[PDB]
Amino acid sequence: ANWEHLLSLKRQGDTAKRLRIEQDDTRLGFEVDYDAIIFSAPFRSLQDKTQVIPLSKTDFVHTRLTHSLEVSVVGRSLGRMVGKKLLEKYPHLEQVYGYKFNDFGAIVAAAALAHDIGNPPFGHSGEKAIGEFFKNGYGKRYKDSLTAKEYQDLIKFEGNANGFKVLSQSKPGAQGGLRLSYATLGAFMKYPKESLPHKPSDHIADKKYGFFQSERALFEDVAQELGLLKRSTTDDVSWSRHPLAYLVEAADDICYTIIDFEDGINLGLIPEEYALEYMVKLVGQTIDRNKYNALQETSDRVSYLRALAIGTLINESVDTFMKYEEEILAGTFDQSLIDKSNYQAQITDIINLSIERIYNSREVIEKEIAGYEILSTLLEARCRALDNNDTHYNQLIQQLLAPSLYENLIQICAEVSTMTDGKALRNYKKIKGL
Amino acid sequence: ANWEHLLSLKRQGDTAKRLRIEQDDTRLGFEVDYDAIIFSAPFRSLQDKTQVIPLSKTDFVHTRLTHSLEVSVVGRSLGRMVGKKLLEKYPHLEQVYGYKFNDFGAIVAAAALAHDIGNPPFGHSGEKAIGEFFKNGYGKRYKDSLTAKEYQDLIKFEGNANGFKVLSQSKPGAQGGLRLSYATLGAFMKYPKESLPHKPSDHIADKKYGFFQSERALFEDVAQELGLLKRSTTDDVSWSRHPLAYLVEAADDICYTIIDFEDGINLGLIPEEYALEYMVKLVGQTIDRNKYNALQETSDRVSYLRALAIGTLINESVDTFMKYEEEILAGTFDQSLIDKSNYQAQITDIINLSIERIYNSREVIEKEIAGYEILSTLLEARCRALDNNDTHYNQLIQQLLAPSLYENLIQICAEVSTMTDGKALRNYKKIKGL
Numbered sequence A, B: 001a002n003w004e005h006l007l008s009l010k011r012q013g014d015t016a017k018r019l020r021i022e023q024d025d026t027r028l029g030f031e032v033d034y035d036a037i038i039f040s041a042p043f044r045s046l047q048d049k050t051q052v053i054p055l056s057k058t059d060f061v062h063t064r065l066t067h068s069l070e071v072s073v074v075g076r077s078l079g080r081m082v083g084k085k086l087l088e089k090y091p092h093l094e095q096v097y098g099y100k101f102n103d104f105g106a107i108v109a110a111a112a113l114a115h116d117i118g119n120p121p122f123g124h125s126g127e128k129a130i131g132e133f134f135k136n137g138y139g140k141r142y143k144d145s146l147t148a149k150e151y152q153d154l155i156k157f158e159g160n161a162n163g164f165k166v167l168s169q170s171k172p173g174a175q176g177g178l179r180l181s182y183a184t185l186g187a188f189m190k191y192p193k194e195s196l197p198h199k200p201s202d203h204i205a206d207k208k209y210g211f212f213q214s215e216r217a218l219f220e221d222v223a224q225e226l227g228l229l230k231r232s233t234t235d236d237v238s239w240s241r242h243p244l245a246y247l248v249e250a251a252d253d254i255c256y257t258i259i260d261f262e263d264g265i266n267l268g269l270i271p272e273e274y275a276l277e278y279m280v281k282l283v284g285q286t287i288d289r290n291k292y293n294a295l296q297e298t299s300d301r302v303s304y305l306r307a308l309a310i311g312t313l314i315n316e317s318v319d320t321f322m323k324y325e326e327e328i329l330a331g332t333f334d335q336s337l338i339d340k341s342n343y344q345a346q347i348t349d350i351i352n353l354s355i356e357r358i359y360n361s362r363e364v365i366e367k368e369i370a371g372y373e374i375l376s377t378l379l380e381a382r383c384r385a386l387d388n389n390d391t392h393y394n395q396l397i398q399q400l401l402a403p404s405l406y407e408n409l410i411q412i413c414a415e416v417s418t419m420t421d422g423k424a425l426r427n428y429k430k431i432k433g434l
């Protein structure tokens, strides 16, 4: 595998190569990617989407937008530091080809900013509501008119794969979606495989899949340009992760681990009495305890803890990446960067506490139950309208929600998934009379 | 004026100088500033604050957070391009001192990200609600126990000055607030003067003021370190704007001009029939009309128009800055970058259309009226509780809203101003029984 190819500036449709040495550094393709996401309608919709806790007006809770912002800031810092060490290890990359360390921060920052852009509302219940609808619900009907992989895309519908669709969807007047650089699309793709075969190993890259059948041709072009290593020689295609995808994943791991905990303390789902017990190993050498004791607000004490722990995990993740860089470059690294952490046990303890106190709180459970009905209802109305587009009621459903059979079902799923929490509830409420 | 001093890396409390040449480029002080704002509680609260249109669940409206994100992306691009041209004009800045063009993008990006962080809820009615409360309302009482400037801070309370307070406020365990680099604080300060004298000229830098009496000592340290030019030799202090403040302002001007228009079309406050008539001069040479005509959604047509016009105004603003760079460096530039635009008349037409159709819409008027009562109510309850902290009711008001006389009144104003739209309405509602 070669870093020169992995850092591709190609955009979908390019008829001629884009050499890094010929880029205007004030218009660097990788940094244009970041700005294109900031201004995109899919990214704006993250402002009104729950990350974990249902939104309120009585308290601040992280939305998908604020979470994605934080992951891109952590990812930019990981890419910057890993970039400098990579340029020191492969100095031809800078001296010949012209890559700079901020290039790597820009790729990770942009892929991180977009990493959750395709996720359905109401969390992973959203994903399973969609999947079960086609497994056993009304969607079962279509099984026999679909290939095994087309159907697998639906019964195991994945927000990561919908994110890739969102980023590249071609519509009239706008071919290629956001047209992000192939390097950013590679750093985005943490599961570079189709929906089948299902979990062919215990590798984290095989836990899910990363693109739908409708996007397969695009990711084939991406993987070829990047020179990603094959992980399958059958007609079920699969590739080793772009190395920078490991940094997007780590930024994400770091943020939801530490920041879910922070939110849980500020919302009162986790007793503040637990904050230091769970963070002491992550912060013990850098914490200024006198400063911590002088802070008079809970939210200030816990944000100080969060900033210390995130700093700790960033430095360690940079070191883990470089110690396993050749294994990662050869596609033989079998785990995540955080799985190798010396704080693995503490991370696991924090995550389990959050699962117990936040994910299993009444409000999060209530939301996931409500989500299952809201999304199943919307999917039933979309699909009935698709099957009999002639009735008056179905023409209304089309006007309200959406003004090849697989291409239609995958598009219905993508459109339901990119609904904000509010719009989905309002449409649900009107379909049901309220 | 010297660019070497204007690019200061000093943080409040520094006992030793910070040379740019000795910075770790993966931990550049200016880029740390950006990340410190992203993670700060004041910036997070912008997620739940209206920019112009009241928030809804039926439609996407820009919050203060999304607006600030967009301004920092436009500002980063302005600073990058202006930086490269400045480094080409003063090559000693890079070859001797070590400044890079991305330094300038980082300063403008961070000051832009924070530029609205202190603004009170419900818009400029929020500011005038606060001002009138002390001019003629309950706050009149204190006039005689306050200096003319201390009082002027209250009756002309300014969100820009509250933003500076927010960014630097010292509390137990956290001296200096976010401790941003003095260069970022200089780019943030577009009105580098105290509340008095009031509008001593028609210069845009004298239209308001930029720091409260409680922050005067800090900005004196900032202006000295930066080497800003004096604009007053009386005991009323005042300085010429940091040159990069002109780029923060332009990024802001560009975004609320074009993006308010975009939001007004998508919300149906402005007829879509007007979109091309008002944008044609801004986009006429770069628009692909066939592409525009092929787009099937309004929101896509208008986002294409917005991206073309923003691109147009960025390039022009970079050129205006460099053509007036010595006047700006000498503090003799008398206007904003956008005031010099060749599209001045079109910008004015767009702004007036937005005022007529959005700012004077029923919903925005309803919000500003409601805001005046909500904030006046909260200020009355805070100030009565301050005057008689012994009564049971006032002890409750203290527990609900806040668990030297000027220092108390300026702190009450800052605390009311940093309330989200929802928390302010809830507290208002409980004080009034609902």
Ligand SMILES: [Mn+2]
Pocket (backbone or CB within 6 Å): A067, A071, A115, A116, A252, A256
């Ligand atoms: Mn995430």
Ligand SMILES: [Mn+2]
Pocket (backbone or CB within 6 Å): B067, B071, B115, B116, B252, B256
């Ligand atoms: Mn603004």
